[PDB]
């Protein structure tokens, strides 16, 4: 009974430990994904656009 | 002088008290042969800025100049070189400098003469504020789709995130009723955090493959789902676990 | 014992998951960094593609 009581807390502590570190992992990971896609979407946007002003010349 | 680069470009040496004192900066500037002033001028191309206070507010409202951090000046001093202008030692800037940064990428700094590296990307990502503001599911699904367009599914762990794979987490589609303190539903709920597989809690219609979780007691539930759905549910026996696909 | 057997398997699953998720974050952060610099470069190549062909008309 005593051993199961401690590891139940240990499971909840590691559940808290797993969640607290990981919650900062995806939040940073999905930040880099979103900060980059705006650069990705807009960099090629002027690339395809300025290529159109080439063929005029 | 000895620098031969400090000539021209009037420097407004008035804010250099971050950690270093004021006088040493302008003494070294004069040794290098640089211009000295403590107020904005027509020839003043750049204005140094150490501590931030009301004069920064004035130069923000009266946008006659920019904010230059002393790190760039220290780099120029130690290297005897003219370090270029990149958005790390800027805080306030002129509009003309804003379209100067529009050459880089927009304002973040994408040098077309110096390629991006680990330092630039890592520190601009650390500096730039969070973009995790809307619902995680839709944004992660968009990340998934753009990954599939570019074949970017390369996470070291591949069980839950964005890797066009779905894992079931409920015995029956309900409010965790069949868990009842003793099935593996809670672990599956906690398992959707940091791995790689398209983030779907349940009912993924875009994946034709059915994988079996650690709950092998859902085989009757999986067959019931197969009968009630049009997706073929197959039992098990790239995840380094009992969860796999053949 | 069944709850404890679940909880021991619960604790081991999270303990195994906690170790691998913290380690993968260091790799994934670099993994995010690799896929972005090449894109910025590959966009720069088509930036470099346009600069020399707008040099002439």
HEC string of chain B? CCCCCCCCCCEECCCCCCCCCCHHHHHHHHHHCCCCECCCCCCCCEEECCCCCHHHHHHHHCCCCCCECHHHHHHHHHHCCCCCCCCCCECCCCHHHHHHHHHHCCCCCCCCCCCCCHHHHHHHHHHCCCCCCCCHHHHHHHHHHHHHHHCCCCCCCCCCECCCCCCCCCCCCCCCCCCCCCCCHHHHHHCCCCCCCECCCCCCCCCCCCCCCCCHHHHHHHHHHHHHCCCCCCCCCCCCCCCCCC
> How many Å lie between the alpha carbon of C46 and the closest alpha carbon of chain B?
11
Tokens of B156: 């070291």
Q: B164 near B148, Cβ under 8 Å?
A: yes
Residue C30 near chain A (CB below 8 Å):
no
Q: In 3D, which of B43, B6, B5, B44 has the Cα closest to residue B25?
A: B6
* Minimal-distance CA residue of chain B relative to A25: B194
Whose tokens are 């069980």? That residue is B159
User: In whole angstroms, what separates CA B38 from the centre of its chain?
Assistant: 37
Resolution (A): 4.2
Bridge-based pairing of strands B11-12 and B46-47 is parallel
End-to-end CA distance of chain B: 73
**A25, A35, A37: residue with CB nearest B128:** A35
Q: In 3D, which of A30, A41, A27 has the Cα closest to residue B150?
A: A41
CB pairs under 8 A between A and C: 64
Under an 8 A CB cutoff, do C21 and B118 touch? no
How many beta carbons lie within 10 A of that of residue B47, not counting itself?
Answer: 25
Residue B113 near chain C (CB below 8 Å):
no
Coil, helix or strand for C1? coil
The angle that helices C2-53 and A2-56 make with each other, rounded to 10 degrees, is: 10
> How many Å lie between the alpha carbon of B156 and the closest alpha carbon of chain C?
6
Three-state SS across chain A? CHHHHHHHHHHHHHHHHHHHHHHHHHHHHHHHHHHHHHHHHHHHHHHHHHHHHHHHC
Under an 8 A CB cutoff, do C15 and A15 touch? no
Residue A32 near chain C (CB below 8 Å):
yes
Tokens of B147: 């990954």
Residue C14 near chain A (CB below 8 Å):
yes
Tokens of B105: 């990428």
> How many Å lie between the alpha carbon of B125 and the closest alpha carbon of chain A?
7
DSSP secondary structure letter of residue C55: S
Residue C23 near chain A (CB below 8 Å):
no
> How many Å lie between the alpha carbon of C28 and the closest alpha carbon of chain B?
7
**B112, B117, B183: residue with CB nearest C37:** B117
Residue B110 near chain A (CB below 8 Å):
yes
Range 60-99 of B in CB contact (< 8 A) with C: none
The values of phi and psi at residue B27, to 5°, are -65, -45
Q: B160 near B197, Cβ under 8 Å?
A: yes
Q: Give the side-chain half-sphere CA count within 13 A for B105.
A: 26
Gyration radius from chain C CA atoms: 24
d(CA B81, CA B73): 10
d(CA B74, CA A13): 47
The values of phi and psi at residue B37, to 5°, are -160, 160
Q: B39 near B14, Cβ under 8 Å?
A: yes
> How many Å lie between the alpha carbon of C49 and the closest alpha carbon of chain A?
9
The residues facing B47 across adjacent strands are B12
Q: Give the residue from A20, A24, A33 with the most B CB atoms within 10 Å of its CB, the best one to mutate.
A: A33
The values of phi and psi at residue A30, to 5°, are -75, -15
Whose tokens are 């996470």? That residue is B155
User: Residues B164, B241, B172, C5: what is their CA dihedral angle, to the nearest 10 degrees?
Assistant: -150
Count Cβ atoms within 10 A of the Cβ of residue B25 and give its class: 0-12 exposed, 13-18 middle, 19 or more buried. buried
Q: B33 near B7, Cβ under 8 Å?
A: yes
d(CA B20, CA B2): 22
Under an 8 A CB cutoff, do A30 and B140 touch? yes
End-to-end CA distance of chain A: 83
User: Residues A24, C25, B88, A38: what is their CA dihedral angle, to the nearest 10 degrees?
Assistant: -80
Q: In 3D, which of B133, B76, B75, B128 has the Cα closest to residue B106?
A: B128
Count Cβ atoms within 10 A of the Cβ of residue C22 and give its class: 0-12 exposed, 13-18 middle, 19 or more buried. middle
| PDB experimental method | cryo-EM
Q: B69 near B89, Cβ under 8 Å?
A: yes
């Amino acid at each position: 009974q005593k051993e199961n009581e401690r590891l139940l807390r240990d499971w909840n502590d590691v559940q808290g430990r797993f969640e607290k570190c990981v919650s900062a992992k995806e939040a940073l990971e999905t930040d880099l994904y979103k900060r980059f896609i705006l650069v990705l979407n807009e960099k090629k946007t002027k690339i395809r656009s300025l290529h159109n002003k080439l063929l005029n010349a | 002088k000895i620098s031969n680069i400090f000539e021209d470009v009037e420097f407004c040496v008035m804010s250099g008290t971050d950690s270093q004192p004021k006088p040493d900066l302008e003494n070294r500037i004069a040794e290098f042969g640089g211009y000295i002033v403590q107020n904005p001028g027509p020839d003043t191309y750049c204005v140094i800025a150490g501590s931030e206070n009301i004069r920064v507010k004035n130069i923000i409202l009266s946008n006659k100049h920019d904010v230059v951090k002393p790190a760039w000046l220290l780099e120029c001093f130690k290297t005897k070189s003219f370090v270029p202008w990149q958005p790390r030692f800027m805080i306030h800037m002129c509009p003309s400098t804003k379209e100067h940064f529009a050459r880089e990428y927009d304002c973040y700094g994408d040098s077309y003469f110096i390629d991006t590296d680990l330092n630039q990307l890592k520190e601009v990502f650390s500096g730039i504020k969070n973009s995790n503001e809307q619902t995680p599911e839709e944004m992660a699904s968009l990340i998934a789709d753009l990954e599939y367009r570019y074949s970017w599914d390369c996470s070291p762990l591949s069980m839950f995130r964005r890797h066009t794979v779905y894992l079931d987490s409920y015995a029956v589609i309900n409010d965790l009723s069949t868990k009842n303190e003793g099935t593996r539903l809670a672990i599956k709920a906690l398992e959707l955090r940091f791995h790689g597989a398209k983030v779907v809690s349940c009912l993924a219609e875009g994946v034709s493959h059915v994988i079996i979780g650690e709950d092998h007691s859902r085989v009757a539930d999986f067959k019931a789902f197969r009968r009630t759905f049009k997706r073929k549910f197959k039992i098990l026996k790239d995840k380094c676990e009992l969860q796999e696909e053949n």
